[PDB]
A = this chain, B = another copy of it.
Amino acid sequence: NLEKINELTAQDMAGVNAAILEQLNSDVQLINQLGYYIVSGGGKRIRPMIAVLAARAVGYEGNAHVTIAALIEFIHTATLLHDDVVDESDMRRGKATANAAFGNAASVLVGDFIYTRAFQMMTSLGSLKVLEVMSEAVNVIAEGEVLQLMNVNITEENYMRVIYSKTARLFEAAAQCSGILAGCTPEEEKGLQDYGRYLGTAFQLIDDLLDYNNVGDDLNEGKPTLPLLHQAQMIRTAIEQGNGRHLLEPVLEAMEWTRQRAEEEADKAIAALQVLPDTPWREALIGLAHIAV
């Protein structure tokens, strides 16, 4: 149950890709150029893949679920263009970033086009509820990024709450809005909502562990990610100082306990997904959680 997902979701994932490329049709070449650069530059497309998978797991058989998948990837794509500017990164998972190749202003402004274009794509579906659920999702995420910019700083519960209510809100919306467009049942809606929130949290926790094993940027700016926290006065300083440069080698110490914590959530999402019909789609959906970790 790993390659089955791709094989099963193949037919529908080729439409989302087509839909994403359809939107890049501005008269301004730069928008299209930068757009083709990041989108066609290799990506695992979990977020649109959750969207299509969620809708057909509750019996949808139009094609609007590819559009909801497509604008979600646009949102995520627009988000990465802005994150590669604030993180001042040179390369995003392999090749160089858009700000490197194209400049900071172009990558920022093309992100605006891409996001606002996802918003028009959202309007055309004509559902006010999906517009509300996602608009607050992306505003909640945007506000937390401003908060991390202005205030550095933790209770296990509290830390997780932030992710549940902010960081992994796009994942949650992705699955929840997919089912809302497919006219699912309130019970199913929560399932997808819960599934999203949790699978995003495990994926977010799992993404904060691959930074150690572009290695070390979490440490190289004082960012309290779950592995980091727990003679260890050299770790507290960095967090408070806001700088942990030159410390990726002498950080092992205890070494994780976050993989089991991410597993908990991975399984947590699975539990909430047992409220909808046993279908290949559902199997695939559940399979993703396992693979997320």
Contacts and interface: CB of A to CB of B under 8 A. Distances in A.
A27 interface: yes
Contact of A103 (B30, B108, B126): B108
Interface stretch (A3-11, A111-119, A272-280): A111-119
Interface string A26-43: 111111000000000000
B147 A27 contact: yes
A142 B34 CA distance: 14
B30 A113 contact: no
Interface in A117-135: 117, 119-120, 122-124, 126, 128, 131-132, 135
Contact of A135 (B102, B103, B112, B120): B120
Interface in A132-157: 132, 135-136, 138-139, 142-143, 145-147, 149-151
B106 A104 contact: no
Interface of A: 26-31, 82, 85-86, 102-106, 108-110, 112-113, 115-117, 119-120, 122-124, 126, 128, 131-132, 135-136, 138-139, 142-143, 145-147, 149-151
A2 B128 CA distance: 39
* Secondary structure call for the A interface: helix
B102 A120 contact: no
Nearest to A146: B109
B120 A103 contact: no
Contact of A119 (B26, B82, B117, B138): B138
Given A119-B119, A123-B135, A136-B120, A112 B142 contact: yes
A160 to B, nearest CB: 14
A31 B143 contact: yes
A82 B108 contact: yes
Given A126-B128, A135-B123, A139-B113, A146 B28 contact: yes
Given A27-B147, A102-B105, A151-B28, A142 B116 contact: yes
Nearest to A88: B105
Nearest to A78: B112
Name, among A104, A132, A142, the residue most crowded by chain B CB atoms within 10 Å (CB to CB): A142
Nearest to A79: B112
A132 B131 CA distance: 12
Contacts of A126: 128
A80 to B, nearest CB: 12
Contacts of A143: 26-28, 31, 113
B146 A120 contact: no
A119 B121 CA distance: 13
Nearest to A128: B126
